Structures are given as C-alpha cells and as structure tokens.
Amino acid sequence: MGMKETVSNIVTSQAEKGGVKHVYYVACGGSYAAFYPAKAFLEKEAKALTVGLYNSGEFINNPPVALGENAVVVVASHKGNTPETIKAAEIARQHGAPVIGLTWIMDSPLVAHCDYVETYTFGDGKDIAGEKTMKGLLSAVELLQQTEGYAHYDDFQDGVSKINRIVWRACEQVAERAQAFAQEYKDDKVIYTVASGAGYGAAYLQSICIFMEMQWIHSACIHSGEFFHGPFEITDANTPFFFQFSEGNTRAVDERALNFLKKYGRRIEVVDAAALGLSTIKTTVIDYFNHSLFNNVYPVYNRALAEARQHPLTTRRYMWKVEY
Amino acid sequence: MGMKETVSNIVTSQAEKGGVKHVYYVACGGSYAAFYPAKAFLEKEAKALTVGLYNSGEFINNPPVALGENAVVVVASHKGNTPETIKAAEIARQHGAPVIGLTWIMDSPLVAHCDYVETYTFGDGKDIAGEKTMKGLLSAVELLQQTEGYAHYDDFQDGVSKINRIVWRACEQVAERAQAFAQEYKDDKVIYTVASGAGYGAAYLQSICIFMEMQWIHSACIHSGEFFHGPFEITDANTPFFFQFSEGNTRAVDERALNFLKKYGRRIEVVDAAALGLSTIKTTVIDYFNHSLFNNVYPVYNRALAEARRRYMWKVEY
Ligand SMILES: [Mg+2]
Ligand SMILES: [Mg+2]
C-alpha cells in the first residue's frame, strides 16, 4: 500500500502533536457515497478514533471544532477541480490537519492543496482491489491498524485479494438476468431502492443512477429497518423495489424487509451478494466488501435498462455533469 | 432527575472505569430523526467525545466494538414498547454501558432496561423547552460540559429559554400562508423536501408527513448541498419543493440551493427560520434550534393541506 506508507508518514508527523484522533472524509457527488464504507468501518471497529463523513459544502461552511493537528482529512475529486472540495483541503491545511487527496488526474488543482495524493483504478476492466472506494477503505484500515491495532487486518487483506475475481465473475453471472430485468421494468417511471449497513452508500448511488435513467421522480432510498416503523412505501402507485440484499451483520435486517415486501406481493428485483459469491470473504470483514460488489455489478443492469428504453423525440431527456 | 444530575451520576460512576468516551443515540422512526440535532451537536462541538446515531435494528445486529463501560447509550421510544429499542437498551447494559431512556410512558417495558429515565413534554400546548428533541440535545450539552467543558453553555441555556415563545408565535404567524399553501398544492401527488445542517432531521420527518397525506410516492429528502452537483431533481414531473431555509452555519448553503431552484422556475414553498423569529437566539448555538422550530411549525401547514384535500392509515412512531 501507497496507503500504508502515507498513513505511516502521517502517524509519524503527528505523534508529537498528540496523535491522530479524528478522520474526516469529504467529497461531493459519487465521491461522497463512495466513502460510506470507510465511515461504517471506523464506527464499527474503532475505540479511539472518531470519523465524520461530510459533503464538501457542509464541511467548509460548518467545519468541526476537532479540525486541527489531531485530525486527518481525506478528500476525493475524480477530476480534481471541484471548487468546494478544494476549499475543504485548503481549510484543513490552514488548521494544520494533514490532507490526503484521492484523484484520477494527478495534474489537477486539488493536488496543490493536499499533503499526500493517492490515485485509483478506473473504467471498464479495472482491478477492483485498487478502485476509489477500496482506497477510501484502505485509508480507514491503515489509520486504525497504525494507531490502535486492527484485530482483523489479515482477514481484510484476504478480502482485498479476492474481491476482483468475485466482481468479474458476478458481472458475467448477472448478464442474462439484467436483460430480463430490463424488459420487466422498462415501462416503469419510478423504482425504490432498499439497503442497509456498510453497503448503503452503493444503494444511494444506484438510486440516483435509476433516477438518471427514468427521470421522473427521485424516490427514497429506504434503509431496510425502516419498513417496520411508521408508514411504509406501499400505495396504489404499485412502485417496484430494487433490493440490495447484503452479506454480513445486517443481512438479518435485509431478510426481514424482503419478507415484508413479499407479504404485500410487491415487484422486487433482488440483487443478493450471497448469490454473487461474496461469501468466501470472511465474516469478520465481509460487510465492507458489499459496496464494491454492488457498485460494480449494477452497471450491467443499468446498461440493459437504458438499451431496453427508447423514447419519442417529443419526450425531453436530460443530461448532467455527474461527479464520479 | 433531569439531564444535569443524570450526567453527573454517570461521570461519577464511570470515573474509576476510564470515564465516558463515546455517546450512542439509538431509536427507530420519529425518535431517530429527533436525535439528529444531538448527533450534529457533538460532531460540531466535541474534541474528545465520539457520537453515533443508530437505528435500533442496525445497532442490535451490528453494535460498535466501543460499546462498553466508556459508552453512554441514549435510547428513546415514545410509548416505550418498540422491541428493537428495548433490545438495544439490554445489549448496552449487558456490555456495561450506562443507559439513559427517553419515553413519554413512565411504566413502559423500556424503563425496566434503562439505568436512568427522562421524560418530555408532548401534545398541543407543550413547553418546547422540554420536548423530546430538546432533552436529546440537553443530554449532549451536559455530556460535553461535564467531561470536556463547553464554551457556549450559557448561550445554549439562553436559547432554551427562548424557543417556546419563538415556536408558539411562529405557529400563529404562518397560519395564513398555510391556507394559501394548501390551495396551491392540494392537487399535487408528490412534493420534495430540502434542508441542510443540524435541522435536517425535521425535514426528513416532514418528508414522511407529506407522504402520509399524499400517499403516492415517497420522494427524496434532498440535502441542500447536493444541488450543486448534477444530477438535479428537475424533470417534467414538475414536482414542487418544500424548502427548509435554516438559520446559522449552513444558511449560505441553503441560500445557494434556493437561488438555483428559483433560476429554474420551480414551485417552492419556503419556510424561513429568520422570517419566523429564530434570530433572537445567539449565532453560537442557533443551528441546534432549527429542528425544534421547523418540527413544530410544519403541523400548521400539514393540517391546512389535509383540510384542503381507499386510504392507507399508517401510524407514526413519534
Ligand atoms: Mg417506515
Ligand atoms: Mg444533485
């Protein structure tokens, strides 16, 4: 790891200042959700490190008081020119926090405001062990490991060594179902997403990818636990559900939600990490690999849906500059 | 006992165990959203205390390793019978974490599983200074004050002393707009909510109230700062936006998002904290009072909407 080395440098420099006590992940768009696994990892595993996950806009208007020499700030920007994210790195450096930047473009303006820069694999055919989300997690595993010890580091590196094969085989495996999925939902206008736990970020991104295909109403990305309380999303609209079924410690919540939806006869596309072979990653760390699986399989489904859908030229279609 | 005394007993009791290092807020449904401000408070203000906000089902299936003698867990259930929340209190005591319970029902099962119980004001004419969201926050302000010190404790107490009158006055103030809102939106099926910062919880809860009236599609509750980066929730559905315009540190984020929506000719109902008298609270602490304000003014709009308008008969968990 580049990350192992980076964190080792940071842990050395800040020792005299009282150590790393706080980690802040800061990004917008698809870079924000990509750090959700790092946030979930530190919340689950840490005893003496705090973690905060911020949109760049909220961070620079309302930075925490702990921002200082005992904080590390990890910023991400695919192209390295998001103005709010650059200001975050700058505000961090002016408070004496070391900044790690994550970017595809090493020339970018962002780089000039980072103490350390890490890049990632990108595009069709990429190695998943080196992708943006995995680098964000590796920052968290190395900060924990090098400050207080991480009981399951070797299981984790075992996981990193398996995820790429798992994902490539999963994408092949969903191909026929994706086609059928496309025919079944090509005439819907709105679809809900459901998820829980450390892969939720991937579901949130998928909810926005569906929105970008369907372009009608941006629907709620429902946490699985929330069906059992108060209102639930079953009405005369007959909206279908795109259901992220996780491996790991929140699988029991997901199963309870899936059974609920089944008792109401809903239309549900289930995408099950267990059915896609995640289960060879050990129980200790499998929660943290859900995101990399789903986020790299959903494009197969999204491509099929797009291709199954053609629009009259009388229908206005929208495009955006989306932040990877 | 009240929060000040309850926290003193905890600091005393965990003194010889390493003291209190982590706070977990754990609830479901409306009680989850109600602890958003507490979480926001500790993440902004604490240098040495960690904070987590969990739904009970998540917490009981995936509890943090730091759950133990240096954690305080604050659980809330209005009727004190939500099973997941009770299980959360029990798991927390079994790990040796002091458990503070918030409930309206003082003989609920939940009380059997907490070390301390606090209650709150509820119902029309309640004192806002004692409402559930405010006891959540006060738990956080006392935890911070008695462990680490808090620079704005007195400003905070001042805010607490003002919020009741601010709220009941704002309720009267919006009454006529609420009627006009109900007429402009009575034929819509879906409406988005938009908010930022320490009061996001109240917008989330409003998203759920709108859906309970409209009963078509549960739409996104949009963070203001996500309208700076595409994609944007602007389509030919022409969905309107119920916009929570906060006072305090993220008011500039809100203002940018509102100007964007205006530039796009969207249909927007603006509820503005600065228009509704919140600005009497010191800017050092005003972020934390947005929730109490919006949460208590929304009902006026919601009742007007329902009046102006087979049904699903969902019950809310307060
Ligand atoms: Mg629900
Ligand atoms: Mg956006």
Side-chain angles (χ1 to χ4, degrees), chain A residues 2-164 166-175 177-281 283-324, chain B residues 1-15 17-123 125-175 177-262 264-318:
Chain A
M3 262 314 159
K4 183 176 185 140
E5 178 68 5
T6 296
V7 164
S8 166
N9 293 158
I10 293 166
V11 168
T12 302
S13 69
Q14 301 316 105
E16 185 151 6
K17 292 169 175 184
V20 185
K21 302 170 172 182
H22 312 102
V23 187
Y24 295 111
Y25 290 97
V26 188
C28 335
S31 287
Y32 163 100
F35 285 141
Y36 189 97
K39 168 220 205 269
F41 176 86
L42 291 174
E43 291 194 302
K44 172 61 181 210
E45 305 296 349
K47 299 203 179 192
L49 212 55
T50 74
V51 62
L53 174 59
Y54 286 82
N55 97 55
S56 301
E58 173 157 325
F59 185 80
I60 65 176
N61 280 283
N62 199 34
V65 170
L67 183 63
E69 298 187 343
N70 308 113
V72 178
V73 182
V74 183
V75 292
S77 178
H78 182 71
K79 305 184 214 177
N81 51 3
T82 307
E84 307 79 357
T85 298
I86 291 174
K87 207 92 307 190
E90 198 72 308
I91 300 324
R93 288 219 303 184
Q94 298 170 187
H95 288 70
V99 174
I100 307 166
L102 208 58
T103 186
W104 177 237
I105 308 308
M106 305 296 256
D107 309 33
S108 58
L110 182 53
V111 160
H113 303 281
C114 294
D115 298 301
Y116 304 88
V117 177
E118 296 291 318
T119 191
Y120 45 87
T121 76
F122 188 65
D124 279 310
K126 73 182 173 176
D127 186 342
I128 307 302
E131 72 172 1
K132 182 170 88 186
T133 285
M134 289 295 326
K135 286 317 173 64
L137 215 22
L138 283 173
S139 67
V141 168
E142 287 294 345
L143 280 161
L144 187 71
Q145 170 57 23
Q146 298 184 43
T147 53
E148 53 174 286
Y150 175 30
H152 308 302
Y153 190 83
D154 297 338
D155 293 346
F156 193 100
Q157 299 301 334
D158 186 69
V160 172
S161 89
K162 290 161 170 176
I163 190 61
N164 188 63
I166 287 160
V167 163
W168 284 69
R169 296 167 48 65
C171 290
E172 153 276 309
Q173 184 197 322
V174 298
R177 178 56 211 162
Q179 296 309 315
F181 164 80
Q183 296 305 309
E184 158 86 13
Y185 294 96
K186 64 184 182 190
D187 294 315
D188 282 284
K189 270 198 145 170
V190 186
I191 309 176
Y192 288 123
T193 53
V194 189
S196 64
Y200 184 71
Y204 182 68
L205 292 172
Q206 181 62 356
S207 113
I208 106 93
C209 293
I210 291 171
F211 172 72
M212 283 166 78
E213 180 51 42
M214 296 309 225
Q215 301 191 182
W216 192 250
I217 289 155
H218 185 200
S219 82
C221 184
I222 308 162
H223 287 88
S224 299
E226 87 196 351
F227 284 113
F228 312 106
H229 307 283
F232 45 93
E233 292 78 356
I234 292 167
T235 71
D236 294 3
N238 299 139
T239 315
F241 298 79
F242 192 95
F243 188 114
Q244 186 173 296
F245 191 7
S246 77
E247 264 279 40
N249 299 299
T250 72
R251 193 179 175 81
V253 189
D254 288 346
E255 182 157 352
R256 184 188 187 194
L258 181 56
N259 283 341
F260 180 95
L261 257 25
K262 283 175 183 181
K263 299 290 180 177
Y264 284 86
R266 297 293 96 186
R267 291 167 53 232
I268 317 158
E269 190 75 23
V270 184
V271 187
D272 183 350
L276 301 177
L278 235 209
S279 316
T280 60
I281 290 185
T283 219
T284 46
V285 302
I286 194 165
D287 298 357
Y288 305 113
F289 291 90
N290 290 287
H291 183 118
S292 295
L293 181 63
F294 294 112
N295 173 249
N296 287 117
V297 160
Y298 290 150
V300 179
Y301 291 86
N302 300 349
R303 286 160 193 166
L305 213 217
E307 144 254 278
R309 283 157 49 79
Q310 304 294 292
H311 314 266
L313 296 173
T314 37
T315 299
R316 288 183 73 70
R317 295 293 294 179
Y318 297 97
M319 56 185 170
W320 299 278
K321 182 226 278 50
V322 58
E323 224 147 6
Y324 294 107
Chain B
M1 229 183 282
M3 280 304 168
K4 187 169 188 314
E5 189 66 7
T6 295
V7 167
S8 311
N9 297 158
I10 289 166
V11 173
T12 296
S13 93
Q14 310 304 111
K17 272 147 194 178
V20 4
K21 289 159 136 70
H22 315 94
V23 195
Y24 300 108
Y25 291 94
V26 187
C28 308
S31 291
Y32 175 89
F35 285 148
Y36 198 89
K39 165 218 132 75
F41 177 88
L42 290 175
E43 64 191 4
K44 170 71 190 189
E45 300 291 354
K47 291 184 310 290
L49 222 57
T50 77
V51 62
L53 179 62
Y54 284 86
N55 141 289
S56 312
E58 169 151 56
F59 184 78
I60 72 178
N61 283 286
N62 197 32
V65 314
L67 188 64
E69 301 167 316
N70 308 105
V72 179
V73 175
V74 183
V75 291
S77 173
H78 171 68
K79 302 190 170 176
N81 57 348
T82 310
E84 300 78 0
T85 304
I86 291 159
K87 225 315 212 321
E90 248 316 297
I91 277 154
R93 291 211 315 161
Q94 293 175 188
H95 280 71
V99 178
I100 301 172
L102 281 178
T103 185
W104 198 46
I105 301 305
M106 294 303 304
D107 61 1
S108 54
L110 179 58
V111 179
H113 303 271
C114 301
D115 300 306
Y116 306 82
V117 177
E118 295 302 314
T119 192
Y120 48 81
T121 64
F122 187 68
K126 64 189 181 171
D127 179 4
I128 302 312
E131 65 175 1
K132 182 175 68 196
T133 298
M134 285 298 329
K135 296 314 192 70
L137 219 15
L138 284 164
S139 78
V141 346
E142 289 304 328
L143 281 156
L144 178 72
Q145 176 56 28
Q146 295 181 43
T147 57
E148 173 176 329
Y150 168 45
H152 307 299
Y153 186 90
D154 302 324
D155 291 348
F156 200 87
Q157 299 309 349
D158 178 69
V160 171
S161 71
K162 279 161 191 183
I163 193 59
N164 192 58
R165 106 173 265 266
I166 290 161
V167 156
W168 291 116
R169 285 159 56 78
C171 279
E172 278 188 60
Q173 177 176 351
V174 296
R177 185 61 247 249
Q179 281 351 243
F181 161 81
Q183 290 298 315
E184 267 90 281
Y185 293 102
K186 59 189 177 170
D187 293 323
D188 284 274
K189 292 187 169 147
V190 182
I191 300 164
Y192 294 121
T193 51
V194 187
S196 61
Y200 174 84
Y204 184 69
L205 288 172
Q206 179 63 356
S207 177
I208 288 164
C209 294
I210 293 162
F211 169 76
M212 286 172 88
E213 174 55 39
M214 292 316 210
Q215 309 200 341
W216 192 245
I217 297 176
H218 183 215
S219 60
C221 178
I222 306 166
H223 286 268
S224 311
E226 319 293 43
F227 280 108
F228 308 161
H229 305 288
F232 316 122
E233 285 84 3
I234 288 150
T235 75
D236 291 317
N238 298 316
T239 309
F241 292 89
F242 195 89
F243 191 106
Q244 190 170 115
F245 199 178
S246 74
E247 184 83 308
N249 283 308
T250 65
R251 173 170 189 101
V253 179
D254 293 347
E255 193 172 68
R256 187 165 166 204
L258 181 52
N259 286 329
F260 185 85
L261 293 174
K262 279 173 183 177
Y264 265 91
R266 292 296 100 172
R267 311 157 59 224
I268 319 166
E269 191 65 28
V270 173
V271 189
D272 188 345
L276 287 175
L278 196 69
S279 314
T280 226
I281 295 170
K282 266 92 175 211
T283 59
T284 54
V285 302
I286 195 163
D287 294 1
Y288 309 117
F289 296 86
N290 286 282
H291 182 122
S292 282
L293 176 69
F294 291 112
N295 183 250
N296 291 106
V297 160
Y298 287 157
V300 183
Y301 288 82
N302 294 347
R303 284 189 287 260
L305 215 208
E307 278 164 11
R309 274 157 55 79
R310 175 273 213 290
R311 290 244 84 186
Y312 300 90
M313 246 60 37
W314 301 292
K315 38 254 294 201
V316 61
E317 266 174 51
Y318 292 104

